[PDB]
Every structure is written in structure tokens, then in C-alpha cells.
């Protein structure tokens, strides 16, 4: 329940939990796919893949350490998990790979075998993971010609034309000290870790700052990846959401909980206290849907994603869903808000407190990099419970009502009507 | 004519008929739209419109 963080030469952030059997240690850099270019796009993902290379991974396996990495938009992270006792040997492997082997991982035999793996990896994604593929393209069109548009896994064309020098160039511009935070989760104490860190000196590229860019911006638009050979239609639609560290950060997430997620095959899901379900179940407008409030450093996306085999009624799916969202500005009820608060706490809890320290590190790391600290789970609940119907209405009237949208879809989307028809539904006629 | 030449009977029946026909035309227009609906409009290229329609 304690979020301890101190700075000496490097910023150290930890969160202890004695009941945890293992401990995870790692470095989280304040730069991700949002820092790349259209041409070196996929370099971060490539780094992650060599860090988990058979060679580097075997060295950690002998020592009894497990490797894990995650490439996001605003950040990047390299994590090593171990037993509570080997909390020192994780730091040896961390330093040995980011300073000593910052040239042994980049061999012309390791790099090629890895490049061939991320190529089959990113290709498999585009060929089969339609829901995530669609969600990735949603960011692509919504934030076109802006940092948030670049996909995390990179594109096949920028990937196959990438070389060892590109990795180095990126590493020497972002893997800096002022653009880093060392994180530790599990059971180890803050004072326990900071000592092993403040022990080993050496700055290594100190005072150096990463390159700057241009601010991210939402552009109402769409990308339609029609493919009549797929057995379904997958669509994602959203408005400009909230950036992390926004006053309405929670109002937005609550609003998404009101409509929540659905799965037509799960008996219990068909019974949720969601008004939209009365409309969509009559003719079974979809197999599933899920709302989200994605937040990043400069912006975010608020909307929903859905999958359906009812290809001749896609317009009803979109129409009923948008009519429900209209409600947030004009008629959302106290009980809908209250139901959302309870369910938001339950999901926010299950995230911030899972039985896995690697998840804790990513959540902690990502937060401290943006606001310099982490809001305690109990602090969130105070903010969540304080939200009134009046708040949700003021938010919706600014973010949802008669606002541009961004759309992306693949599969049998002939039935997804034109942009203007969808856009017109972002409001209602009144006297 | 209703007689020996164009006279009163003629003009009175022509007004009655002038009032009637517009309604028969209206019924024919509906039949015209019905035939139009089953195949839809054509376009300036003279080819199929099935690959790209807008409401
Ligand atoms: C002798 C020919 C002809 C006459 C007279 C005619 N139509 Fe048409 N109409 C057509 C044809 C053929 C089309 C299909 C055009 C196409 O899609 O290429 C058509 C299409 C239409 C359309 C669709 C839009 C358009 O302009 O293509 C409407 C509406 C329509 N007609 C209304 C009428 C009405 C109302 C009348 C008369 C009161 C009328 N038509 C008289 C031949 C005719």
C-alpha cells in the first residue's frame, strides 16, 4: 500500500508487499513507439526481442532469473523476475546487459535470427489478430501524422529495412538516465534496493536529453480495411479521450464502465445492468463489444470496439450504441453512475493488485514517469466515489456531444455506413 | 365530342378527365419507382454500382 520513490543520481521507485513469493526488478524508459519515426518504426519492439533472445535469456535462466519486456506508446520496459533472495543478482544481469553487453547482444548472427522472428511475429498479427489489428489502426487514423499514430510492433516495411545502427542510434538517444526510472516490485524494501544501486557508481551518458517533437492531435477520420473473406466484422470507434493526469481521467473511465463490455455467449453477461443490452439482444447485433478509456501522455481515446456476424444489421449496432452514448449528456441516471462506480473499483482493484509483480512494475513505472508519483488505490476510490451525474454530463457534453469520431474496421464491413451517418448520431434533434 | 362538334358536353367532359388523369399518372409513377427499386439506378460509367454505394 506504500509508494516509495527517491532520487540520488537515478530515480528509484518501489512498492513492497511481503506476502509476495517473488520480486521483480527492471528499468522503465520514458520513451516508446510514440518517440519513433515512420521510418525506424519498430526499433523499440526489436530491442525488446533481443533482450529476450535465446542467448541473453539462457544466461538469466542458469542464474534462475526470468525475463520480461513491454513496448508501449509513451514508455518502454525491461524486467527481470527472481526470488526475494536473489534481488541482487537481478541488478547484475540488468547492468551486464545495458552496459557490458550493449554490444554483445547486437551481433550479426543474433540480430538476423531475431529480425526474422519479429517479422514472422508482426506478420502473424496483421494476418490474424483482427480485433487488436483494428484497434491499432484506430490509433493510426485518429492520430495520423502525429506520435500516437505509430503502431507499437512497428510496420513490416520499416522493420525489414532496419539495421544494427538504428538500434544503437535509438538506444543512445532514449536509453538515457534522465529518461529512465528503475522500478522494483515484489517484496523487497525500498532501502534494500536503493543501496545496491547507490553502491555501484558510474553515470554513463549523464546530462544527455532525448530529442523533442510535435504535440499529438486527434483528427476525426476513418480507415476501412474491408475483407469479405473474413467471417465477421470487427470495428472500433472513438472520440478524443483524456490524457493521463487529466481532471476528468476518472470521469472518462467511469463513463466507459456504464456501457462496459459484453459477450453474447456468456449467460451472466446478457444479464448486466446495461440499457444498451435491451436493444442489441433482440436481433443479436453482435457477438461482443467493450468500451474503453485509453489514456496517454498527450491525449487519449474514448469509445468502443465490437465484433459481429450479423453483417446486414451493423447499422443498428452502431445506431443503438451511439444513442446510448447520447444519454450521458442528457439523461444518465443516478443508479447507472452508482453501478459504474462499484464496477470501476472492482476492475481498478483487480489491475493494481494482481498476483503478479511484473504487472505491478509496468503500472508503477508508467505512472511515475509521467507525474513523478503514483496515486494510491485508496486515493483513486475517493475520487471515483466523488463523481456526480452532473460531472458525467459536463464531461460528455464536451467530449461526446456533436464531436468528431475516428473509425476503423476490417472483415465484412459493407454494412458499416458512411462517416457522416455515424457522425450525425453523435447527437439528437431538439426543439 | 358528345355531339355534332366541340361544344359544351366536350369541355365539361375534358375538365372531368383533366382532373382524373393526374391521379393515374401518380399511380404509374409508383409503378415506375417500384421497377427502379429492384435494380437501383444506373451510373455514368455504365457499369455495376454494387462495389461502392452511399445512402
Ligand atoms: C420514357 C422514359 C421515362 C419517363 C417519361 C420517365 N422516366 Fe423516370 N426513369 C426512367 C429510367 C429509364 C430511369 C433509370 C435511369 C438510370 O438509373 O439510369 C428512371 C429513373 C427515375 C428516377 C430516379 C432518379 C433519376 O432521375 O434517374 C426517378 C425518381 C424517376 N425516374 C421519376 C420519374 C417521374 C416522377 C416521371 C414522370 C412524371 C418519370 N420518371 C418519367 C425513364 C423514364
UniProtKB/Swiss-Prot annotation, chain A:
Annotated signal peptide: none
One of the Pfam families matching this protein, by short name: Peptidase_M16_C
Subcellular location per the Swiss-Prot or TrEMBL entry: Mitochondrion inner membrane
Keyword terms: Electron transport, Membrane, Mitochondrion, Mitochondrion inner membrane, Respiratory chain, Transit peptide, Transport
InterPro entries assigned to the protein according to its UniProt record, in alphabetical order: Metalloenz_LuxS/M16 (IPR011249), MPP/UQCRC_Complex (IPR050361), Pept_M16_N (IPR011765), Peptidase_M16_C (IPR007863)
GO BP annotations, alphabetical order: aerobic respiration; cellular respiration; mitochondrial electron transport, ubiquinol to cytochrome c; protein processing involved in protein targeting to mitochondrion; proton transmembrane transport
The keyword S-adenosyl-L-methionine is assigned to this record: no
Family, per entry: Belongs to the peptidase M16 family. UQCRC1/QCR1 subfamily.
Name of protein: Cytochrome b-c1 complex subunit 1, mitochondrial
Phylogenetic placement of the source organism: Eukaryota, Fungi, Dikarya, Ascomycota, Saccharomycotina
Swiss-Prot record, chain B:
Residues annotated as binding heme b b562: 18
Transmembrane parts of this sequence: 8-39
Binding site for a ubiquinone: 37
Binding of heme b b566, residues: 32
Segments on the Mitochondrial matrix side according to the record's topology features: 40-55
Assembly and oligomerization: Component of the ubiquinol-cytochrome c oxidoreductase (cytochrome b-c1 complex, complex III, CIII), a multisubunit enzyme composed of 10 subunits. The complex is composed of 3 respiratory subunits cytochrome b (COB), cytochrome c1 (CYT1) and Rieske protein (RIP1), 2 core protein subunits COR1 and QCR2, and 5 low-molecular weight protein subunits QCR6, QCR7, QCR8, QCR9 and QCR10.
Further comment: Heme 1 (or BL or b562) is low-potential and absorbs at about 562 nm, and heme 2 (or BH or b566) is high-potential and absorbs at about 566 nm.
Purpose: Component of the ubiquinol-cytochrome c oxidoreductase, a multisubunit transmembrane complex that is part of the mitochondrial electron transport chain which drives oxidative phosphorylation.
Protein family membership: Belongs to the cytochrome b family.
The protein, known as: Cytochrome b
Gene giving rise to this polypeptide: COB
Span covered, complete protein: 166 to 220 of 385
